[PDB]
Amino acid sequence: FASVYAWNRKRISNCVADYSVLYNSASFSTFKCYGVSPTKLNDLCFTNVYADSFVIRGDEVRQIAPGQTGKIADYNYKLPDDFTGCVIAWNSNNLDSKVGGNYNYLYRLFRKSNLKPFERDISTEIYQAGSTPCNGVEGFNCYFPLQSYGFQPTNGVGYQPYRVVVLSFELLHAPATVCGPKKSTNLVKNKCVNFNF
Amino acid sequence: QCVNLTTRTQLPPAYTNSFTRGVYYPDKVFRSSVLHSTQDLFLPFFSNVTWFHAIHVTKRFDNPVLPFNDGVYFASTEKSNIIRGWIFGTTLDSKTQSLLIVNNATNVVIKVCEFQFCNDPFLGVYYHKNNKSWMESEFRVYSSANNCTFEYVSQPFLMDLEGKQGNFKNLREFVFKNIDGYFKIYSKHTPINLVRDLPQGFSALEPLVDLPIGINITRFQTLLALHRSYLTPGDSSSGWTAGAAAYYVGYLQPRTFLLKYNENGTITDAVDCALDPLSETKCTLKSFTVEKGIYQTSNFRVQPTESIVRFPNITNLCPFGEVFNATRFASVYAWNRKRISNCVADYSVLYNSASFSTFKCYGVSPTKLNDLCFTNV
Amino acid sequence: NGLTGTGVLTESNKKFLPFQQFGRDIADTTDAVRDPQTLEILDITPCSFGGVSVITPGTNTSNQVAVLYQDVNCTWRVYSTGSNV
Amino acid sequence: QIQPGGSLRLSCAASGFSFISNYMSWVRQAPGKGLEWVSVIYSGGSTFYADSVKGRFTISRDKSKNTLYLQMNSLRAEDTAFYYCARGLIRGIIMTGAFDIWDEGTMVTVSSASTKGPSVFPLAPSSKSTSGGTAALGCLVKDYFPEPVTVSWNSGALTSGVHTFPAVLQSSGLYSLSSVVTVPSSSLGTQTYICNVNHKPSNTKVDKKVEPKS
Amino acid sequence: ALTQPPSASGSPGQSVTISCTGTSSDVGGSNYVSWYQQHPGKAPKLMISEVSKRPSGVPDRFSGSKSGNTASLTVSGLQAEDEADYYCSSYAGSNNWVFGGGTKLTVLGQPKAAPSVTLFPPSSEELQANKATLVCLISDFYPGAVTVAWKGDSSPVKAGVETTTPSKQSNNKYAASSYLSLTPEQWKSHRSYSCQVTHEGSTVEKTVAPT
Ligand SMILES: *[C@@H]1O[C@H](CO)[C@@H](O[C@@H]2O[C@H](CO)[C@@H](O)[C@H](O)[C@H]2NC(C)=O)[C@H](O)[C@H]1NC(C)=O
Ligand SMILES: *[C@@H]1O[C@H](CO)[C@@H](O[C@@H]2O[C@H](CO)[C@@H](O)[C@H](O)[C@H]2NC(C)=O)[C@H](O)[C@H]1NC(C)=O
Ligand SMILES: CCCCC/C=C\C/C=C/CCCCCCCC(=O)O
Ligand SMILES: *[C@@H]1O[C@H](CO)[C@@H](O)[C@H](O)[C@H]1NC(C)=O
Ligand SMILES: *[C@@H]1O[C@H](CO)[C@@H](O)[C@H](O)[C@H]1NC(C)=O
Ligand SMILES: *[C@@H]1O[C@H](CO)[C@@H](O)[C@H](O)[C@H]1NC(C)=O
Ligand SMILES: *[C@@H]1O[C@H](CO)[C@@H](O)[C@H](O)[C@H]1NC(C)=O
Ligand SMILES: *[C@@H]1O[C@H](CO)[C@@H](O)[C@H](O)[C@H]1NC(C)=O
Ligand SMILES: *[C@@H]1O[C@H](CO)[C@@H](O)[C@H](O)[C@H]1NC(C)=O
Ligand SMILES: *[C@@H]1O[C@H](CO)[C@@H](O)[C@H](O)[C@H]1NC(C)=O
Ligand SMILES: *[C@@H]1O[C@H](CO)[C@@H](O)[C@H](O)[C@H]1NC(C)=O
């Protein structure tokens, strides 16, 4: 996947959304939808589908929600207050950890201001905590703004790495291309019918 | 390949009026024979837009760095394809990510990576007489492009690039918005026949694209094309001819408009419900015609000019390290209770010392914790 | 002290007891406040005030209009001044 | 002691260090002048050194246990000083820029020649030292390394006016001092005034008589 | 380095000031100025933090301020025992970290004393020893901020001189000594030398001529 400070964003185009094929391949343990109920997912068509993905600590999974504070939600990944998609996260200690620690995963620790929703800050300029500048060297009151998680395999759960996918989309209003597993019928005109368009 | 141009004359800026320009379809729903009231980022009616040109003979190649406040209405009157695109960003100097929309003579290129832009970015067309052709020669925009995130390249084509000598025949209008990491572009092309001073009329811009770029934007700059031929001796920084084009820039603000859809579904007119009291009444009446009389409008409003904050004189930081970092806690049947007095609540200092995994507030939202004062802590 | 708002601040004659910080009117809006650094009382007055009417001869005849500010006395809180006041 | 061109290991304890903003500078002090900064280590792995030291000294922290190492290499014998471990003071994430915990330091001496015996001269009583009823005479004992040295007057007899001044450390690296005593000017040469010089690290014992100038 | 005057003292139960008067870009161009304290034998102890702040302990007689390129300390009330050195300190530009010079702070409850000076020329045996040393002894000068200057016939000299730091005697006043290195041909070259000592503005000098 990707680390959280430079998070990936994949575009989901014209395809069929059958999420039952996942029933035998992976469990989740966090799966929350926001603009829509989970019982009507395979009955709708979705307009702008995007899939963000990253890896965070197990304790920070609660931060992936609208209206949150903390290290991830302040300046690593911010959701809007009118969010619509679904948030999914699963434990990944058997994959993304190794003996001695896996330092391929980073996070931002210092910033001047909070992020706006759905922006990305991949700059590595040295954060100035003091009044005197420091001209691009680390030292007195100047820190490198990115740190690494330490993922050794026997950690307390919640220090173990979690993979998080955020599904973003829209409903009705515009043309869609995803749809669910529903099957179509013929067009009956000039009669009273229930319809699903 | 990056030059600082010269042989440019000095002039003050020019301004113009926007005669009810810059309206776009605010959703993707079809409406017919109706008047719809909508609030959004619009260009106010009869606004003072800024005017930029480039006519040589006097040379005038305007492409300064302009603010991008809340959105931009951009209009271009041309005949020979001089404006080619824009660059958007905050510093434009490879310490931050920037967006580039450009039109080569063959493709449209959109790229959102780390560019090192020049002081005078441009393109350049060369004109031969021996060979019967204007051809695209220079592309001098950036020096480097390191950590790209988004990229799109259109299907190939070939533009004309040929220099005309008549009057401005093409008007192209764009609206640029940037919200929730989406860069939205609305566009409209119109055939005109004009000499200067962006015209009057009404045409609604249709949605062009939404790019998921996710960057911060506060400034932007226009990309113009240059002309070089056997009559431009120079060396490479004085031997250029400008051409002929003009473009106008205005800024959007949040307004309420009343749009009119004809029977075919086209927006043909609009009322700016905050331009005058007359328009206030037109808009509260939901009609374009007002009958003789006297009408009550809203009370007289005054807008705030400044923002002030007044907190008490507190210097210390709260004991975050002797509450969360204690050595030995208490058992639950005899639980401890510490009194928090006059101190500063900076809970960001905990961001690198301890994770939590349960943190729930009850009377207050977590996004307003460092904006309040607390009484009995 | 965390309480946000909009208005005009003026020097006050109210005098708070030491355990008081805000003052409220009958509609329960905050109309007085003690400044937390200078310990002086201030009154907070709203900013919008006064009715406005527009007189038109009909927009099917002209778009000339007149405006009546029902709370102004000129001998200003107006949108424009033009001529013929 | 260590001859120049050597090396030395100075170690201290970085208890509670891995949090960022935890500077642990090192500061020297010459025996008599005053304080002077030497080096600094920042907990994000950054090292910085003062001038006139740079390239010869190196900090290499042990992230294994907790121990902090300053390796001095090729000492120039103008570094003889107490060396302190100054731990910083932090106001949250902001380094305050002051050192609150010290450690009493280690004495680091750099010399040469090892040891040496004193050279003695008698400083005669003179009219330029004479004033009215009294005149002063003494003994100058100079150029010795092994610090503890003693000079008595007349095998310990005279205790009046006998004052031995603190030894001085020259640029040559050897000590020197002079002990003087006043005695009535009527008694310039009259009685015995013999300074007994004893050097205890060596075995030097010499008696020198002081008499008025010829 | 920075500058602070090496001697300042006053009556017990009063206010004494100490100026640090650095340049710009360490003291004027910053705000991280501190003050320490070193009793004669112990480690330094942080006495005043940034500008004007205190740790715990540190009884509120000590105060600090900054007025540009000069920060200053002020002790309001000498109890009996605040004799120290009081180094001021600052963070300079590039992680530099500069220091001060140190000011002794006594409290002569009685009346100042006069530095008794005594000067000796190189003995005869030393003349025969192909060398020469002038000996300047200072004694009994209560308040210890003495300094010394050496003189050839008319000019000052600054080479070949060593100066002891003041040392406390039994009577709890001070003593010091200085040595001048000379080749005997330079000893007879100049017609006379002298040692001068300055102490609280006042000055006393002694002089000797070769034979
Ligand atoms: C174009 O002109 C600009 C000045 O307007 C030149 O800018 C400086 O560039 C150097 C690096 O080469 C920087 O260190 C300076 O800080 C810049 N100063 C300013 C005022 O910008 C630029 O070098 C010129 N480039 C060319 C090709 O002429
Ligand atoms: C809060 O701090 C301000 C300064 O930051 C203090 O204001 C001073 O007030 C005294 C009145 O006794 C004036 O003489 C000073 O000139 C003020 N200083 C400034 C910079 O304006 C204020 O006193 C502090 N609050 C309290 C309760 O003391
Ligand atoms: C020392 C007690 C001071 C209490 C101040 C009173 C109110 C201010 C509330 C602060 C909430 C602190 C929670 C820490 C959130 C960090 C989230 C994370 O870990 O990512
Ligand atoms: C956008 O960039 C500007 C640079 O001037 C910066 O001040 C601002 O904080 C950035 N946006 C956010 C939301 O921080
Ligand atoms: C636009 O604003 C400028 C600002 O000074 C002013 O000079 C100019 O007259 C304005 N133009 C119009 C048409 O109001
Ligand atoms: C125009 O620029 C894009 C940017 O990479 C490039 O891919 C394209 O090939 C260029 N046009 C032509 C005709 O090569
Ligand atoms: C036209 O001639 C120019 C040289 O004058 C050459 O660079 C260019 O490639 C030629 N183009 C064609 C189509 O011949
Ligand atoms: C951007 O480039 C820098 C330097 O080449 C590199 O350190 C950094 O990892 C790059 N960004 C990403 C997301 O890899
Ligand atoms: C749409 O309406 C216009 C007049 O407003 C009319 O000229 C045109 O024919 C209509 N379009 C059609 C034919 O659907
Ligand atoms: C408390 O802080 C110390 C560092 O001072 C750290 O080593 C320890 O792990 C912390 N313990 C808790 C419970 O925070
Ligand atoms: C007002 O305009 C309408 C349509 O243009 C017209 O039918 C009407 O007659 C006009 N009013 C008068 C009084 O003529």
Side-chain angles (χ1 to χ4, degrees):
Chain A
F1 272 41
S3 97
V4 65
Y5 86 103
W7 41 270
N8 199 68
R9 191 204 204 35
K10 193 176 169 61
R11 150 61 112 199
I12 315 298
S13 242
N14 47 267
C15 58
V16 114
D18 212 358
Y19 59 77
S20 319
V21 313
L22 292 164
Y23 287 0
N24 44 3
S25 33
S27 24
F28 283 139
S29 88
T30 245
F31 170 80
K32 167 110 185 40
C33 291
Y34 284 87
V36 65
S37 325
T39 48
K40 345 237 352 181
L41 283 180
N42 47 30
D43 238 31
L44 296 178
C45 292
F46 315 100
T47 71
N48 255 14
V49 172
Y50 279 113
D52 312 332
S53 58
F54 37 85
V55 166
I56 49 181
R57 219 190 295 191
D59 295 334
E60 302 153 353
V61 187
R62 91 185 181 279
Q63 296 205 18
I64 315 296
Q68 292 306 290
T69 53
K71 178 177 69 180
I72 302 300
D74 287 9
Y75 30 75
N76 278 90
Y77 191 78
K78 179 69 174 170
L79 288 187
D81 292 350
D82 51 322
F83 180 59
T84 318
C86 304
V87 181
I88 302 99
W90 68 92
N91 175 277
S92 304
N93 188 72
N94 51 353
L95 263 69
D96 275 311
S97 175
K98 41 173 185 165
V99 182
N102 171 36
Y103 305 96
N104 298 152
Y105 292 116
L106 281 79
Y107 59 95
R108 188 173 299 271
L109 187 55
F110 288 117
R111 220 166 158 274
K112 292 179 178 293
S113 21
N114 295 322
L115 280 172
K116 289 293 217 309
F118 276 144
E119 303 170 336
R120 192 195 286 103
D121 194 11
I122 62 158
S123 110
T124 60
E125 309 300 318
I126 299 190
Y127 174 74
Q128 178 191 329
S131 25
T132 79
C134 55
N135 319 124
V137 299
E138 316 172 326
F140 190 80
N141 286 334
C142 285
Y143 318 99
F144 195 63
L146 305 187
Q147 299 309 121
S148 168
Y149 290 107
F151 284 138
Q152 324 151 4
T154 64
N155 283 329
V157 57
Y159 277 78
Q160 308 191 353
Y162 273 62
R163 288 199 176 173
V164 179
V165 185
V166 181
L167 255 24
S168 177
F169 55 73
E170 261 130 1
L171 293 179
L172 296 5
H173 288 113
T177 41
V178 168
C179 276
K182 221 135 143 74
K183 307 248 157 201
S184 101
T185 335
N186 311 174
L187 203 48
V188 220
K189 294 187 254 188
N190 314 314
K191 296 184 43 192
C192 208
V193 293
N194 307 98
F195 56 80
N196 191 321
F197 280 94
Chain B
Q1 300 172 21
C2 162
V3 288
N4 277 13
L5 288 180
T6 29
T7 43
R8 190 147 46 188
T9 322
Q10 281 291 13
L11 274 170
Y15 305 88
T16 298
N17 198 261
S18 119
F19 314 92
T20 73
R21 282 265 176 194
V23 186
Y24 49 91
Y25 289 81
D27 4 75
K28 312 243 193 310
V29 183
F30 180 85
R31 295 176 218 267
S32 172
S33 292
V34 96
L35 309 194
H36 194 240
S37 166
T38 260
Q39 171 170 247
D40 225 277
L41 286 150
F42 290 110
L43 178 64
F45 280 179
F46 307 106
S47 288
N48 220 18
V49 311
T50 323
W51 187 1
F52 302 99
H53 21 245
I55 195 74
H56 165 36
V57 201
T58 287
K59 235 169 192 176
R60 199 54 211 216
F61 217 54
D62 296 280
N63 51 9
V65 189
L66 312 154
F68 184 105
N69 287 120
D70 275 84
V72 157
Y73 169 80
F74 181 93
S76 106
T77 51
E78 344 193 87
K79 46 180 163 88
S80 95
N81 293 323
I82 298 294
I83 287 108
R84 308 273 229 158
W86 316 260
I87 66 191
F88 310 82
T90 94
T91 52
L92 312 169
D93 68 350
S94 182
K95 292 190 309 282
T96 34
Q97 275 194 121
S98 303
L99 162 74
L100 167 115
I101 311 176
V102 84
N103 192 338
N104 285 351
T106 118
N107 302 81
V108 188
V109 175
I110 306 187
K111 277 188 185 179
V112 176
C113 352
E114 296 195 323
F115 296 105
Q116 175 82 53
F117 292 118
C118 294
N119 242 343
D120 284 324
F122 58 83
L123 285 73
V125 183
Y126 200 81
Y127 168 53
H128 313 104
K129 337 222 337 177
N130 41 10
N131 212 340
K132 309 190 274 276
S133 288
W134 304 65
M135 299 240 275
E136 174 90 8
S137 80
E138 352 208 290
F139 174 88
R140 309 195 153 180
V141 189
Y142 53 84
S143 325
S144 358
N146 262 70
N147 278 317
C148 214
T149 306
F150 176 85
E151 180 170 348
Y152 166 80
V153 184
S154 83
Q155 333 238 357
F157 53 82
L158 191 70
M159 279 206 339
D160 226 56
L161 309 167
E162 199 203 70
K164 319 296 190 180
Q165 275 300 177
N167 352 74
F168 294 151
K169 287 287 197 304
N170 288 123
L171 173 74
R172 304 185 174 104
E173 314 177 72
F174 296 97
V175 161
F176 303 129
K177 289 197 291 174
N178 185 40
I179 350 123
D180 321 3
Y182 277 98
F183 192 83
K184 326 172 91 66
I185 304 174
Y186 305 84
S187 142
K188 185 50 144 284
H189 163 66
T190 8
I192 59 163
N193 190 324
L194 157 95
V195 293
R196 55 194 294 112
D197 222 294
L198 155 89
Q200 320 173 106
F202 193 93
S203 147
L205 324 190
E206 310 183 350
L208 184 54
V209 83
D210 297 299
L211 313 169
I213 63 172
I215 68 175
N216 187 25
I217 295 185
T218 34
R219 307 194 296 167
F220 85 106
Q221 183 171 167
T222 313
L223 267 54
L224 314 172
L226 226 40
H227 282 169
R228 260 158 184 148
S229 105
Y230 78 115
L231 299 153
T232 59
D235 38 342
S236 186
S237 146
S238 299
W240 55 277
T241 248
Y247 65 89
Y248 320 84
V249 178
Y251 301 113
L252 317 175
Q253 352 189 211
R255 313 280 275 207
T256 316
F257 275 36
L258 182 84
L259 305 324
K260 161 178 169 38
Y261 298 79
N262 64 38
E263 112 236 32
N264 290 337
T266 313
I267 299 181
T268 46
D269 214 354
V271 163
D272 187 3
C273 307
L275 175 61
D276 307 300
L278 177 55
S279 320
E280 250 180 67
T281 31
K282 291 219 211 73
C283 176
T284 205
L285 258 51
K286 291 238 189 318
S287 145
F288 277 62
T289 53
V290 192
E291 286 211 310
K292 185 176 74 136
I294 176 173
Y295 306 83
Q296 306 281 136
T297 49
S298 70
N299 282 206
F300 182 75
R301 316 267 177 163
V302 175
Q303 296 300 294
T305 83
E306 293 188 15
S307 265
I308 80 173
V309 188
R310 298 295 280 183
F311 281 16
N313 263 326
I314 305 284
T315 98
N316 308 314
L317 185 103
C318 284
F320 281 117
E322 74 178 326
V323 167
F324 292 94
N325 191 231
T327 166
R328 165 183 303 106
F329 268 46
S331 97
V332 65
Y333 86 103
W335 41 270
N336 199 68
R337 191 204 204 34
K338 193 176 169 61
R339 150 61 112 199
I340 315 298
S341 242
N342 47 268
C343 58
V344 115
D346 212 358
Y347 59 77
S348 319
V349 313
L350 292 164
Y351 287 0
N352 44 3
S353 327
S355 25
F356 283 139
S357 88
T358 245
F359 170 80
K360 167 110 185 40
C361 291
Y362 284 87
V364 65
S365 325
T367 48
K368 345 237 352 181
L369 283 180
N370 47 30
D371 238 31
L372 296 177
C373 292
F374 315 100
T375 71
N376 255 14
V377 172
Chain C
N1 273 212
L3 179 77
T4 43
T6 314
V8 182
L9 314 165
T10 46
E11 262 189 43
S12 177
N13 283 201
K14 310 183 183 187
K15 238 122 170 166
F16 289 11
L17 289 171
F19 60 90
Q20 285 160 340
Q21 171 86 202
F22 300 110
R24 284 172 158 72
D25 55 2
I26 139 112
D28 258 21
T29 56
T30 300
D31 70 326
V33 71
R34 160 183 273 142
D35 186 57
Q37 298 189 22
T38 60
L39 301 190
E40 88 170 289
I41 318 291
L42 301 167
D43 267 276
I44 307 164
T45 265
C47 215
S48 314
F49 186 90
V52 170
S53 324
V54 56
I55 295 115
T56 214
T59 60
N60 228 2
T61 266
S62 155
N63 320 245
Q64 237 175 305
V65 300
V67 182
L68 174 81
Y69 301 94
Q70 320 171 176
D71 269 79
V72 183
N73 167 291
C74 18
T75 54
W76 299 316
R77 290 175 59 105
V78 303
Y79 293 139
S80 156
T81 225
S83 191
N84 316 132
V85 214
Chain D
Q1 328 172 345
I2 175 152
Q3 198 267 325
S7 275
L8 197 36
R9 177 76 41 192
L10 288 202
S11 293
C12 271
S15 298
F17 199 85
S18 182
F19 187 40
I20 81 169
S21 75
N22 267 300
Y23 63 107
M24 173 49 109
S25 155
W26 292 72
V27 168
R28 71 166 46 164
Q29 168 180 38
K33 299 310 182 62
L35 303 180
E36 190 210 307
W37 180 68
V38 167
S39 81
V40 64
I41 177 72
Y42 293 151
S43 83
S46 306
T47 83
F48 290 113
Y49 303 97
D51 215 327
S52 85
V53 183
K54 178 164 189 184
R56 302 140 43 166
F57 278 32
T58 285
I59 315 178
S60 304
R61 54 173 302 184
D62 174 91
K63 300 207 61 172
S64 297
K65 271 273 295 173
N66 260 326
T67 80
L68 261 40
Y69 289 167
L70 172 69
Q71 179 173 178
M72 318 193 278
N73 295 318
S74 63
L75 306 101
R76 291 239 164 202
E78 306 81 24
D79 309 329
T80 165
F82 277 78
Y83 280 75
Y84 296 119
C85 301
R87 199 183 174 100
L89 163 68
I90 54 170
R91 204 166 36 83
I93 71 167
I94 284 179
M95 306 184 204
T96 66
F99 316 100
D100 44 3
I101 288 97
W102 298 68
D103 71 313
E104 205 260 343
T106 305
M107 182 74 198
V108 177
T109 79
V110 279
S111 69
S112 356
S114 83
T115 167
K116 205 253 154 281
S119 147
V120 190
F121 300 125
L123 312 92
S126 208
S127 158
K128 47 207 157 192
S129 325
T130 312
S131 147
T134 325
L137 35 58
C139 279
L140 182 169
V141 37
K142 68 181 315 302
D143 282 340
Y144 59 88
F145 167 82
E147 297 63 25
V149 174
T150 296
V151 168
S152 166
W153 274 112
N154 299 337
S155 325
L158 200 34
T159 327
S160 80
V162 172
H163 254 187
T164 192
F165 284 72
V168 65
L169 198 276
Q170 314 165 171
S171 42
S172 99
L174 295 134
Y175 289 95
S176 324
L177 81 92
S178 228
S179 163
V180 74
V181 52
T182 81
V183 52
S185 38
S186 84
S187 53
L188 306 191
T190 63
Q191 219 258 349
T192 167
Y193 315 112
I194 45 107
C195 58
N196 333 71
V197 177
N198 56 321
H199 193 183
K200 284 317 109 207
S202 33
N203 320 306
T204 322
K205 175 36 84 169
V206 173
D207 294 48
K208 207 53 177 182
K209 177 84 209 316
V210 192
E211 311 112 350
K213 294 165 177 55
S214 320
Chain E
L2 303 185
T3 304
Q4 34 182 345
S7 42
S9 283
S11 292
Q14 216 263 332
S15 279
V16 191
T17 80
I18 290 173
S19 42
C20 185
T21 172
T23 170
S24 170
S25 87
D26 42 5
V27 188
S30 316
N31 222 37
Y32 313 116
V33 183
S34 61
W35 296 83
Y36 298 88
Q37 149 160 340
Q38 181 168 199
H39 275 270
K42 272 85 188 168
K45 158 174 184 181
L46 170 64
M47 199 57 51
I48 287 93
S49 174
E50 28 184 9
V51 190
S52 316
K53 273 173 206 176
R54 273 102 49 81
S56 190
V58 54
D60 193 358
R61 294 174 283 119
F62 309 100
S63 43
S65 92
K66 185 187 73 175
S67 64
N69 298 277
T70 300
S72 90
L73 214 64
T74 292
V75 191
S76 70
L78 287 94
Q79 303 297 317
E81 70 276 0
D82 298 6
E83 313 159 320
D85 280 10
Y86 299 117
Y87 295 89
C88 61
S89 174
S90 156
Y91 160 71
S94 69
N95 324 5
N96 281 162
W97 265 118
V98 72
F99 272 154
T103 78
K104 275 185 185 184
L105 190 138
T106 43
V107 58
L108 33 104
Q110 320 145 286
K112 283 73 153 324
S116 146
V117 181
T118 300
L119 193 163
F120 276 73
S123 337
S124 49
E125 289 91 346
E126 183 185 15
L127 310 193
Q128 308 141 8
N130 316 0
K131 267 320 289 194
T133 326
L134 263 297
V135 177
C136 185
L137 310 84
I138 306 164
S139 171
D140 325 304
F141 51 101
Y142 212 48
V146 52
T147 162
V148 173
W150 282 85
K151 157 261 152 181
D153 304 322
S154 34
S155 33
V157 202
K158 309 75 161 152
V161 280
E162 308 70 19
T163 51
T164 322
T165 43
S167 143
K168 195 211 58 181
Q169 319 167 179
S170 101
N171 49 12
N172 288 245
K173 61 210 327 207
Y174 293 139
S177 147
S178 313
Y179 288 79
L180 163 57
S181 80
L182 321 93
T183 163
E185 63 85 60
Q186 251 173 316
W187 164 239
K188 211 42 180 209
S189 144
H190 277 64
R191 196 35 200 111
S192 174
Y193 300 100
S194 87
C195 177
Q196 74 88 73
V197 318
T198 99
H199 176 19
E200 313 326 285
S202 184
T203 299
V204 298
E205 171 261 21
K206 263 242 198 168
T207 300
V208 168
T211 38

